[PDB]
Amino acid sequence: MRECISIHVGQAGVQIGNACWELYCLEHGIQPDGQMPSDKTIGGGDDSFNTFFSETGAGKHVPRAVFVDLEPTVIDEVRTGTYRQLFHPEQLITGKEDAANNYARGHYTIGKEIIDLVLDRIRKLADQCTGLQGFLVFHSFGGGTGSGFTSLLMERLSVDYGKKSKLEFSIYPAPQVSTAVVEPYNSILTTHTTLEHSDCAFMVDNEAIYDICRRNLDIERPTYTNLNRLISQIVSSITASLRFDGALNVDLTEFQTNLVPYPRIHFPLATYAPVISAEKAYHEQLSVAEITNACFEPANQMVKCDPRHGKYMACCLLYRGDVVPKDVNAAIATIKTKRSIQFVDWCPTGFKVGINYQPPTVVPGGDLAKVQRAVCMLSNTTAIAEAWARLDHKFDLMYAKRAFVHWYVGEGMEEGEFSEAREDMAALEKDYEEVGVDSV
Amino acid sequence: MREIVHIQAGQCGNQIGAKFWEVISDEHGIDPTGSYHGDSDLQLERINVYYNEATGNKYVPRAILVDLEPGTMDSVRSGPFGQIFRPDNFVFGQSGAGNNWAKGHYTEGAELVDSVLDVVRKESESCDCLQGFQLTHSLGGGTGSGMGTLLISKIREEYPDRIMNTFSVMPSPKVSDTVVEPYNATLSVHQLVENTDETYCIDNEALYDICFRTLKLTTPTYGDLNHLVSATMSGVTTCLRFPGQLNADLRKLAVNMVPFPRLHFFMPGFAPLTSRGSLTVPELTQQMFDSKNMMAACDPRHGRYLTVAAIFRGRMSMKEVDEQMLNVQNKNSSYFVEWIPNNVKTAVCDIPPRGLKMSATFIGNSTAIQELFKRISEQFTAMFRRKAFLHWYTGEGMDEMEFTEAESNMNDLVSEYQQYQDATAD
Amino acid sequence: KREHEREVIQKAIEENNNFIKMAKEKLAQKMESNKENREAHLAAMLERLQEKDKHAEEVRKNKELKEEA
Ligand SMILES: C=C/C=C\[C@H](C)[C@H](OC(N)=O)[C@@H](C)[C@H](O)[C@@H](C)C/C(C)=C\[C@H](C)[C@@H](O)[C@@H](C)/C=C\[C@@H](O)C[C@@H]1OC(=O)[C@H](C)[C@@H](O)[C@H]1C
Ligand SMILES: Nc1nc2c(ncn2[C@@H]2O[C@H](COP(=O)(O)OP(=O)(O)OP(=O)(O)O)[C@@H](O)[C@H]2O)c(=O)[nH]1
């Protein structure tokens, strides 16, 4: 019951997938060969970690996950690497030719050749669930597969699973690690196409994560490995309620109720603390008060934007590790009397709190200090629309001259799809303005 | 794998073609016999992009050698890596093209093109996933220019969804006094604008100037010029040949570099270019953006960049490269079009060229490339207004109308560069 | 009240089914339009190339008739 199926799409989705599943295994005591000594029920169970892992009769704990990419070289490293025994070969799906940074190739030309196979593989995972709750879809905005194939997949999932929940972790592009000039096109196209098919989407701004690694972990020039380990800690905080039990544990769906006031307004801002090196953490315990305060520091947000210049529609605090309500309540009280936290007038101002008692874990050879306690704040703020504004403006600059548009038209698309997508984004930006205006 | 098929046509094409294979064979640890004897797995990881693997662990260039005369290819076969090429992949005639584009394109060339296509087909058939093609040739002669562009059109017809890439050597009076070269060049550009996805403009004018002015060579040989060409070709293909994130295949490169289909003519550059007995990341970066380091005789400060790719090779600070690339864009912001955000992409490859600790290679899509085409156009019209030497071409069946059309198209291309140069975001 | 309870749940079912139907029809239309557009693009390209072959035959024929001089 309550199974969740993860789908990792394109290079960013897959490599972030690598980092998350490695981290989950460490959190649950699952070895790279899938064996889990502590699990006394062989070949099945309804434990909390079974939401993310199925079990074979031979005692293997297998991720409820599909990895998909239109070229093979990223997934080949999964097939041949440390956790290769973890996955059944059929869970790892590849084509020969990628989408060349072109949404149109991901959604149409190349994607259509593999979409039926991908859905068949997902169906095989679904059939093994007794109470499937929904999907978690990991992908970049900027890549041709991450944008175009993800959109196609989400559309097809709506048809095949109806209104079964679909959540995204979406990688928003940054110039420091971007690989295509057309990523703003791809971002607007996939955001428009997927908008009606996603229930909730956690955007991860690569520039925000890049900055955090440079500033808080003292990494000179962060690699995807650096970025992905941090992102997996944040993803793990968000899914921990699904994978662990506990008296004070609050289900993600319950936070979701508060986080989505209207279908289109479904983009929470995640903030995570503490991000600190081993050298800085040594002999320096960060209390509940300190990590809570850090959530209202914009430098620690997963998306660059300024909530102090917007309005809140929800604030959720997801704690893990050595944390009790007494300390949380005191920390929140201090914050309410010192911070730029303004809510819209049609929303209650209470902070919603969840506590998972299983302490944070780290991967060997990582940059993050092992800490006793951590917190992920999920807020619904009008400020996140800043991210759309920046992207929409880059789109406008290029599209006014129709730069690179021939690449998309050549693969069968029409200018009509571009302006339709961009108008949807304009409406979204306007939606975020409107929800912030006071009631009459 | 993602295979590339290499074709080299005519004297120039086979010369710089041969040097290309010698240079990258060394980089990949492949000896003249096709055996691997390198010391790094990075050398073999993407070896199949350019090499076929045969029996005996032998590596064979996916290369086809074409000429309407046996001469250059006989000497190719006698070159250092001459025995490395597939003997069945030598296709040649006996006539010669006599520096006549029409003979290469319509007559002699057309008689030979089918046998070439048979070999292209055989190489393409055994490709796991063909990327496309790269052609090396000059535009000033008869075979590389005429038969080269014919091959492009024929290959396009059979592989319409694959990428077509050329290394096209532009003629200059400083190197060759053959009078009809601006005719051949203009007729060729007319084809390239319509039928290639990306063209590296290797300008003999620039190669000569670099050798003479900078390297202080009083009498540059084709040997000297071709070192510049092979250094450049090695650099601009490193992202295709070694593991990496940026522009790692022909189509991703085109999608990053070509904002409008016709404007696909690149200005290549290389650093360091320094005289004998005369190298920081900052110094590398400044040099690669200087006009004196361009392989096309154009000043980038006479136009604007639509798109740019920069490739640094060797052991260096990634942090420092990022800072210097940011710095150069900041200080030179006027020379990058504002309506293409983030139009400069940078890659760093750990493996440097032979004999160098550090190198940089530059690929510019600059509206300043119009200076190259204006130069060819000036030389073209000075002959064409007198109708000089036309009987060479009309005697093969062509008429003056085709010359007029080729001239107008190239003049259109220049106008188009000027249009986007003058365009503003507001 | 029972009548209303029945209407609410049948309404929920109808809206979910209509969402699925719309999504399916929209995707079919898009994929067909895309297929047609791409095929037309390639067809235009090959048509131009075939004109080139046509012109080449014309050139060789023109040379042939002048050598009959
Ligand atoms: C005439 C200059 C010769 C050498 C210079 C000092 C430089 O060498 C080093 N180590 O920095 C080189 C790179 C020059 O800047 C270039 C102009 C050389 C260049 C490409 C062309 C000249 C026109 C040409 O005469 C050529 C025969 C002269 C010297 C070659 O042996 C240099 C080697 O040739 C290469 O192509 C690789 C890059 C590398 O192996 C390089 C060490
Ligand atoms: N955080 C993070 N971002 C990544 C990673 N890999 C790629 N990206 C970002 O994703 C975008 C590029 O899309 P990719 O996922 O590489 O492309 P793809 O989905 O494989 O699509 P094609 O290769 O075009 O078929 C750029 O913004 C990259 O910076 C990763 O491992 N981690």
Ligand SMILES: Nc1nc2c(ncn2[C@@H]2O[C@H](COP(=O)(O)OP(=O)(O)O)[C@@H](O)[C@H]2O)c(=O)[nH]1
């Ligand atoms: N850079 C360079 N240019 C060459 C070489 N060989 C010939 N050229 C140039 O190519 C043009 C002549 O074309 P060529 O290839 O000899 O004629 P083809 O054999 O009929 O294709 C002239 O502009 C020459 O300067 C070479 O090895 N290197």
Ligand SMILES: [Ca+2]
């Ligand atoms: Ca069990």
Ligand SMILES: [Mg+2]
């Ligand atoms: Mg990819």
Ligand SMILES: [Mg+2]
């Ligand atoms: Mg010659």
